[PDB]
Design a protein around this nucleic acid. Structure first.
Ligand SMILES: [Mg+2]
Ligand SMILES: [Mg+2]
Ligand SMILES: [Mg+2]
Ligand SMILES: [Mg+2]
Ligand SMILES: [Mg+2]
Ligand SMILES: [Mg+2]
Ligand SMILES: [Mg+2]
Ligand SMILES: [Mg+2]
Ligand SMILES: [Mg+2]
Ligand SMILES: [Mg+2]
Ligand SMILES: [Mg+2]
Ligand SMILES: [Mg+2]
Ligand SMILES: [Mg+2]
Ligand SMILES: [Mg+2]
Ligand SMILES: [Mg+2]
Ligand SMILES: [Mg+2]
Ligand SMILES: [Mg+2]
Ligand SMILES: [Mg+2]
Ligand SMILES: [Mg+2]
Ligand SMILES: [Mg+2]
Ligand SMILES: [Mg+2]
Ligand SMILES: [Mg+2]
Ligand SMILES: [Mg+2]
Ligand SMILES: [Mg+2]
Ligand SMILES: [Mg+2]
Ligand SMILES: [Mg+2]
Ligand SMILES: [Mg+2]
Ligand SMILES: [Mg+2]
Ligand SMILES: [Mg+2]
Ligand SMILES: [Mg+2]
Lengths: 86, 137, 71, 23, 208, 116, 96
RNA sequence: AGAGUUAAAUUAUAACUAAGCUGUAAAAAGCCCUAGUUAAAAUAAAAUAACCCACGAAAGUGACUCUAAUAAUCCUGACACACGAUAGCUAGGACCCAAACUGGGAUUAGAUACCCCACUAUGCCUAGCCCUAAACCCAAAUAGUUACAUAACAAAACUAUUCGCCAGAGUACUACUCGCAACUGCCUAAAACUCAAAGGACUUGGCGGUGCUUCACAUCCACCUAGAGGAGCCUGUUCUA
């Protein structure tokens, strides 16, 4: 509002394909959480409720992170087995 | 071909024109896309309104005007009324998160109007006024 | 880290939004991530550095952070 | 499970508050 | 299903078997057909090698048939084709050289064209949402559309004729009226199209 | 890098106050979850709307606009072909990853030890 | 594993180095025992479930005139012997 | 704890432009002194950083700046002393926005609810009260050990020094007392009587208007064909007889 206009959350379209520009914008906003934030501010969410969410999210993230880590570590051993029909 | 996603700052020497105008001189298409309705207003760079079209203006009624189709129809209409007053290129400003966002944009293109830049200015409070309570107690 | 140089600060901001990046992006000792945050907010209110967007001048400086928007 | 205990107290208290209003 | 899934449908076309030597992939294909020691369902009584049979005419014949009467329905079809024919021969000799160049006398091409004109583009499916049944615009498969055409024809020329009036008469009438797009059948098609525009917003409820 | 687990959970030894309250214990399971099937949305809606405009304008005579009819048809064909052919390849190829069956087997070959 | 620490000579850069003096001490004893069981005409059963050496071990056993189980070990094989193997059976006198 | 300050929103208020705007699973009611854009004080609340885990005795504290500042040469300890979320009370000031209550609109058999719109007490500041919370990390403070050792579940098992508590379930966060700026209050806290259980954790079922996958092949929806439900008869039920 007091900032200069058009410098922010702005994407310029290339070779006239708009769908792509918009996609890029939406990716920018998804990445910075602006989208989730917008969506979550439609209604209010009482502090305890928010505390609970943050905690659940962080648990969830820890688990996904670690499972992923174990996948990428175990990934080598998916290769065809040498010892078949031993 | 060097193509910057970032717009052309005013103080810069930067030379790009669309029909001979600077990036600053191009008209602005404001689009407010809200959950029950989508409104569009094309305006001069100098902020004189050229054209206005909304899903209500387009003769949909209560729930139907929520949908994407409606939004697109408003887009086309807006662009017609706009090209009448002779605006070839327009910079989109999308305000709000709704069912009609993308649709009203590509309706602006469908309706024979050229979109150069598409900006999102959605109110994001940094915590001002408390929004209304949640649904289903 | 000094609130007075907006250049260094403006490195750890998102160009489009003006958000401050997390550790998992900037990759800083907790100490510095903190110093950076505090310095940023200080700058923003003393009127050195813009809040909602990364100042366009500093767009082409070196990119330290791990985020990729355009794919 | 435990709520059965709580529920009981809950009821008691309600009924009593009600009564203080009448009485 | 007195045929196991092993049994392939027969290919009745004579032209396919008569002139093989110019196509590689198809030679390979029917080579694999018979040489697979593949079982073939016995060719049905309806279908023939006849140079004269139109599968669309036969379908229509069937949809007209009540009970078990092919003889009667094939009668009514035959009579209807003959009736369109003679109606156009009547319209030909009372006309002038220009209109004698214009007017179509092939009852087959008339049948086909009259069905192509009467087939709907878009359609409606009921969808339950929030305890209400909304009618929603649905794109249709080809077969569904042809079906809708034929069924609408027959339903009208069964239902709306005066009891004195015979079937091949009314049917030839409606075939010729649908040839020129002014038939009541076509009005039905339009009622659908208009109901589909009235509801176009609801096109979002469709999830597929 | 994984978020820190030190000091987070409520335990007899921990000096401070809980940060996480996990709903179910944080122990890597020996299988992964099954991929969530994509929510469908309506297809061809744009071409439909264009055709409907063409009709409203030309008074619903089909002869008038053959292009939008034909293109709406073309599109519905591409949505049928899409529904048929995408199901199988989305159900097999995960791109850089493995089908959840193979992942589960791989994870049973090198399981987590909660016990001992 | 916790119970192994007495047998570790130590840990070199993260690897655990078993103490060979003790390995020799023990191995002498195991071999001694094995041998005396063999001399006394008793059944020896080599057991491993590791699929590299499975063939190697099955081979080895067949060459000593001793038995090998290298495969999946059925549930009640030792405890419920007479059902899995047969009506009356001898069970291994030693298992390696 | 003070004092000072404000970026993003939001709003009084004008200026253009448009007839609608708002609102839902869908509507209605409301508003058109409305809506979009451009300008904007006050008030209130503090995106991102935070995938951090710091400060405080606890309650609590995460916009910015400065001033003052975080007891004990560190054992336990009250009914004494000083604090103590939200709500609430008194008085004065504020009021963007939210909102018990209430009034409208739907919904429903009803709807004194859930859903929609308006608006109030109240949420804010100053001063004083009130002293309660699932004030729960349901895990007392201070030193320690990882020895012995699995009821179950949960956050593994234990020593020493202390203090506070607990003797079936109801009755009962009740009745009577004492004290208290509390006067529909807090605190303290019985008995008659009634029962032969009340509780805790688990197990297998069954169920679930719970979620995720996969299906239905005359089969639920989509769809196809012929019928029934209306007529006369035929024949069977129920009634009445
Ligand atoms: Mg509640
Ligand atoms: Mg009671
Ligand atoms: Mg502490
Ligand atoms: Mg739990
Ligand atoms: Mg401001
Ligand atoms: Mg005011
Ligand atoms: Mg009204
Ligand atoms: Mg803030
Ligand atoms: Mg201290
Ligand atoms: Mg003390
Ligand atoms: Mg208090
Ligand atoms: Mg108060
Ligand atoms: Mg007051
Ligand atoms: Mg008020
Ligand atoms: Mg309100
Ligand atoms: Mg009411
Ligand atoms: Mg004060
Ligand atoms: Mg608390
Ligand atoms: Mg307690
Ligand atoms: Mg104590
Ligand atoms: Mg006891
Ligand atoms: Mg008692
Ligand atoms: Mg109480
Ligand atoms: Mg009391
Ligand atoms: Mg007493
Ligand atoms: Mg059936
Ligand atoms: Mg009958
Ligand atoms: Mg009937
Ligand atoms: Mg009857
Ligand atoms: Mg009887």
């Amino acid at each position: 509002a007091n900032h200069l206009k058009f410098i922010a959350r702005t994407v310029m379209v290339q070779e006239g394909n708009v769908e792509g520009a918009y996609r890029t914008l939406n990716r920018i906003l998804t990445m910075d959480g602006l989208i989730e934030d917008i969506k979550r501010r439609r209604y209010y969410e009482k502090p305890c409720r928010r505390r609970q969410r943050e905690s659940y999210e962080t648990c969830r993230r820890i688990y996904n992170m670690e499972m992923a880590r174990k996948i990428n570590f175990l990934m080598r051993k998916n290769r065809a087995d040498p010892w078949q029909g031993c | 071909s060097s193509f910057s996603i970032y717009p052309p700052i005013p103080g810069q020497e930067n030379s790009l024109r669309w029909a001979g105008k600077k990036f600053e001189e191009i008209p602005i298409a404001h689009i407010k896309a809200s959950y029950n309705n989508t409104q569009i207003q094309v305006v001069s760079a100098a902020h004189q309104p050229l054209a206005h079209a909304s899903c209500g203006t387009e003769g949909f009624r209560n729930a139907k005007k929520g949908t994407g189709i409606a939004a697109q129809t408003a887009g086309i209409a807006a662009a017609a009324k706009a090209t009448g007053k002779g605006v070839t290129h327009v910079r989109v400003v999308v305000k709000g998160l709704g069912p009609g966002r993308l649709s009203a944009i590509k309706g602006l293109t469908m309706g024979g109007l050229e979109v150069i830049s598409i900006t999102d200015n959605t109110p994001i409070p940094h915590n001002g006024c408390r929004p209304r309570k949640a649904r289903r107690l | 880290v000094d609130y007075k140089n907006v250049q260094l600060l403006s490195q750890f901001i998102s160009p489009f939004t003006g958000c401050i990046y997390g550790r998992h992006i900037t990759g800083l000792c907790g100490k510095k991530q903190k110093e950076i945050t505090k310095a940023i907010k200080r700058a923003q209110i003393l009127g050195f550095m813009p809040v909602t967007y990364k100042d366009p001048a500093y767009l082409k400086d070196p990119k330290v952070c791990n985020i990729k928007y355009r794919e | 499970k435990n709520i059965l205990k709580i529920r009981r107290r809950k009821m008691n208290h309600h009924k009593y508050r009600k009564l203080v209003k009448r009485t | 299903s007195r045929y196991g899934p092993e049994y392939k449908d027969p290919q009745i076309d004579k032209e396919y078997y008569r002139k093989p030597l110019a196509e590689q992939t198809e030679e390979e294909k029917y080579e694999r057909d018979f040489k697979k020691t593949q079982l073939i369902k016995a060719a049905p009584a309806t279908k023939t090698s006849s140079v004269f049979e139109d599968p669309v005419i036969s379908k229509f014949t069937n949809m007209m048939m009540k009970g078990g009467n092919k003889v009667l329905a094939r009668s009514l079809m035959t009579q209807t084709l003959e009736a369109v024919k003679r109606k156009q021969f009547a319209k030909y000799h009372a006309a002038s050289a220009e209109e004698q160049a214009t007017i179509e006398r092939n009852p087959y091409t008339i049948f086909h064209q009259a069905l192509k004109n009467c087939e709907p583009v878009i359609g409606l499916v009921p969808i339950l949402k929030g305890g209400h049944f909304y009618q929603v615009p649905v794109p249709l498969a080809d077969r569904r559309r042809r079906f809708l055409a034929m069924k609408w024809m027959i339903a009208e020329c069964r239902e709306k004729k005066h009891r004195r009036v015979l079937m091949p008469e009314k049917l030839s009438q409606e075939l010729l009226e649908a040839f020129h797009n002014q038939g009541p059948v076509i009005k039905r098609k339009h009622d659908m199209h208009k109901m589909a525009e009235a509801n176009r917003a609801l096109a979002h409820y469709r999830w597929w | 890098a994984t978020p820190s687990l030190r000091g987070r959970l409520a335990r007899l030894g921990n000096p401070r106050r809980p940060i996480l309250k996990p709903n179910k214990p944080l122990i890597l399971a020996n299988h992964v979850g099954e991929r969530r099937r994509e929510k469908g949305e309506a297809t061809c809606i744009t071409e439909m709307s264009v055709m409907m405009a063409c009709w409203k304008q030309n008074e619903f005579r089909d002869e008038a606009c053959r292009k939008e009819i034909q293109d709406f048809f073309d599109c519905a064909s591409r949505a049928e072909a899409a529904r048929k052919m995408r199901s199988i390849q989305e159900n097999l190829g995960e791109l850089g990853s493995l089908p959840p069956k193979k992942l589960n087997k791989l994870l049973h070959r090198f399981p987590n030890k909660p016990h001992v | 594993h916790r119970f192994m620490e007495p047998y570790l000579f130590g840990s070199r850069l993260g690897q655990d180095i078993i103490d060979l003096e003790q390995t020799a001490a023990h191995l002498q004893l195991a071999l001694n025992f094995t041998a005396h069981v063999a001399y006394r005409e008793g059944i020896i059963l080599f057991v491993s479930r590791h699929r590299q050496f499975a063939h190697l071990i099955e081979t080895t056993a067949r060459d000593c005139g001793e038995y090998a189980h290298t495969r999946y070990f059925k549930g009640g094989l030792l405890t419920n012997a007479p059902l899995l193997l047969g009506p009356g059976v001898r069970l291994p006198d030693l298992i390696i």
